[PDB]
Amino acid sequence: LGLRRAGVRKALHDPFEDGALVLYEPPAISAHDLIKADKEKLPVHVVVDPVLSKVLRPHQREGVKFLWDCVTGRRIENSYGCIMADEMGLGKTLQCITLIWTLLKQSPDCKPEIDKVIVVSPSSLVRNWYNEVGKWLGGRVQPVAIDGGSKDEIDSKLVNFISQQGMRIPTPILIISYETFRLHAEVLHKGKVGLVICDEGHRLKNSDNQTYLALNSMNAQRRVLISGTPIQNDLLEYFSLVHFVNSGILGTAQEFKKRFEIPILKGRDADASDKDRAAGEQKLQELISIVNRCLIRRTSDILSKYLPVKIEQVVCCNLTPLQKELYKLFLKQAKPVESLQTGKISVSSLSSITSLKKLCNHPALIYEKCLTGEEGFDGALDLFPQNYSTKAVEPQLSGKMLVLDYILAMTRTTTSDKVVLVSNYTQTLDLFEKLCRNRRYLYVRLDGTMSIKKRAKIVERFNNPSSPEFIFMLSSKAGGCGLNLIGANRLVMFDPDWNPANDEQAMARVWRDGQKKTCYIYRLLSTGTIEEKILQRQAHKKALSSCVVDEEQDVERHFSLGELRELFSLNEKTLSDTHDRFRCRRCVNGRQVRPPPDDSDCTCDLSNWHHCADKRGLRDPVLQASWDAAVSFVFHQRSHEDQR
């Protein structure tokens, strides 16, 4: 377009190019008014930079529209807050960076909305966010990461970030960890930051008084809070969050406490006056409407409309004879059910859970305690095989590790697929590194000590088909914020976290834009073990819509006599405790007699997954070949049908 020029008031990017994403158009004006009006005062289109809009899927176009609407007070007028509550894997970083880049450079009045943004992030994901900026918009913008270093070296970085003048601001995007942010937010007070993005912001429950104070100190007008689950189901745990996001129309913290919080709690009190019960609930409903107004949530099933078929398989693996004997012997000696009860407690039940989880992963992780003769492993060293060591890992000694071994071995000879290995535990990854060396698989491990540059490098090497690396292993805490391992076709989620959002995030590293193959996710669980109980509590949290909890293995006052007993049980007979607990009406004597509902997919309850107790009806030859004594049961499902 030549009707553009250098030195005319115009939208930063042509609002009429084929696939433009127009976030704003100027209001209609009458011909008469237009002619008299001064041309340097007319609103201008806001149009997403083509560099980014060329690359956004439909849902992503909708997301940026939603964000931009919210954050500029066009959705809820007088409020500048937004809760982004998409399922993991729909590219939250891309939508956000698009938001940022739009706000940094454009507004209806034809100048930037904001001058600087702060992204608050888990420590493990800080570097991922930084890389995500580089990946999407190249040399155009320079982000800055702050995460640890000297208390004074951090202060310097922050001071440099804030004291930046007008027009050309070399460092307009800051990414700090929550840890450093909460300890340093005084620097940010009155420092004119336009936007905050609190990532993984569901960790900001009412008791996190540090972060909210720090967040208040900063006082950025427009606020995007990201969360795994929707909030409204468990609203009472999220007053602060709701208020931070919506303070534009909720008023002061004290005003909000007075109108909403105090009445709501007053009515919920076990002796409220019926009139009081009614008043509070009414206020809760008002609050729910506000959250509804400002929250966006899309689920991962919409990816199936342009990605290859994904196949998810939860695999129940039988504990080794050895593992069982250790497990039994631990329970018998530790007596974790009879170690802490009426009053609170969580000291020695945390550690007994911790030990059993290690045990399920591999006895080797438990071996050190057997040498000590520490409480719960007396004479356990006698159970270990005739001749054993540290250096060589023996995958047969563990159910899950065996199946892992099998999958990798089958995958390597049957396909030319690459594999992502995920574990919640460093020491488990250390065993994977040993396995790989012994099996002669080449691999890369995403550390956490890894520099920003080296992090970008190894990912790009891995996604290249020319690369010789077979396995990419990472710890799930690092498996988010746009990390994309598209070169890999299959992913093994080795062990379950208490929070379902964490597993979900890490699993979503492979079935993403640009994937060219059918994907296979594997979740390994040890049959009749705490692991099934973990996957069960995950399900329970998701089922009750919201339910975010970082605490679980910590403060164990939310279980009780019988439910605890269950947590520390061993079922040696079941094919899957998870399945038993369904009381499935679709399976008869190990055969699946009726299929799941027609339109059910990977986003469904395990009760609507395919249940499989014989290696019959699997859609993954690698898994089938891997099914021996080690596998007792498989839940499986798929994104959609390949036919397309």
**Residues found near Zn ion in the complex (CB under 5 A):** 584, 586-587, 611
Nearest approach, Cβ of residue 603 and Zn ion (Å): 18
490 vs 611 by CB, closer to Zn ion: 611
606 is in an annotated binding site: no
The runs of H, that is alpha helices, within 319-385 are 321-334, 347-361, 364-372
249 vs 584 by CB, closer to Zn ion: 584
**Euclidean distance between CA atoms 177 and 125, whole angstroms:** 8
Number of other CB atoms surrounding residue 248 within 10 Å: 17
Nearest approach, Cβ of residue 402 and Zn ion (Å): 25
Under a CB-based contact definition with an 8 Å cutoff, are residues 79 and 246 in contact?
yes
Under a CB-based contact definition with an 8 Å cutoff, are residues 75 and 293 in contact?
yes
Closest CA to 529 of 634, 399, 428: 399
Under a CB-based contact definition with an 8 Å cutoff, are residues 126 and 177 in contact?
yes
At residue 218, what is the residue type?
M
Nearest approach, Cβ of residue 589 and Zn ion (Å): 11
Under a CB-based contact definition with an 8 Å cutoff, are residues 479 and 491 in contact?
no
385 vs 595 by CB, closer to Zn ion: 595
Nearest approach, Cβ of residue 584 and Zn ion (Å): 3
Nearest approach, Cβ of residue 378 and Zn ion (Å): 40
Closest CA to 310 of 58, 521, 523, 509: 521
Give how far the C-alpha of residue 359 lies from the chain's centroid of Cα atoms, to the nearest Å. Answer: 26
Nearest approach, Cβ of residue 594 and Zn ion (Å): 9
466 vs 589 by CB, closer to Zn ion: 589
90 vs 613 by CB, closer to Zn ion: 613
Contact partners, residue 620, CB within 8 Å, separation at least 6: 311, 313, 520, 636
At residue 177, what is the residue type?
S
121 vs 576 by CB, closer to Zn ion: 576
Q: What is the full DSSP assignment across 79-119?
A: --EEEE-PPTTS-HHHHHHHHHHHHHH--TTSS-S-S-EEE
87 is in an annotated binding site: yes
400 vs 579 by CB, closer to Zn ion: 579
86 is in an annotated binding site: yes
Angle at 230 between CA 84 and CA 68, to 5 degrees: 20
42 vs 587 by CB, closer to Zn ion: 587
Nearest approach, Cβ of residue 611 and Zn ion (Å): 3
Nearest approach, Cβ of residue 543 and Zn ion (Å): 17
Return phi, psi of residue 120, to 5°.
-95, 130
Nearest approach, Cβ of residue 562 and Zn ion (Å): 25
Q: Are strands 310-317 and 631-638 parallel, antiparallel or unpaired?
A: antiparallel
89 is in an annotated binding site: yes
Nearest approach, Cβ of residue 579 and Zn ion (Å): 6
Nearest approach, Cβ of residue 623 and Zn ion (Å): 18
Q: What is the full DSSP assignment across 211-263?
A: HHHHHHHH--SEEEEE-SS-SGGGGGG-HHHHHHHHHHHH--HHHHIIIIIHH
CA distances to 202, 232, 240, 350, 547 from 208, in Å: 11, 19, 9, 22, 16
312 is in an annotated binding site: no
Helix 123-137, helix 452-463: angle, nearest 10: 60
243 vs 579 by CB, closer to Zn ion: 579
Residue with token string 């991922």 = 128
**Euclidean distance between CA atoms 368 and 388, whole angstroms:** 13
- Residue number with the smallest Cβ distance to Zn ion: 584
345 vs 584 by CB, closer to Zn ion: 584
137 vs 584 by CB, closer to Zn ion: 584
Q: Are strands 488-493 and 418-423 parallel, antiparallel or unpaired?
A: parallel
491 vs 634 by CB, closer to Zn ion: 634
For the chain, percent helix, then strand, then coil, each to nearest 5?
Answer: 45, 15, 40
Closest CA to 385 of 313, 456, 323: 323
91 is in an annotated binding site: yes
Under a CB-based contact definition with an 8 Å cutoff, are residues 488 and 420 in contact?
yes
Nearest approach, Cβ of residue 581 and Zn ion (Å): 11
90 is in an annotated binding site: yes
For the annotated binding site for ATP, the residues are: 86-93
For the annotated binding site, the residues are: 86-93
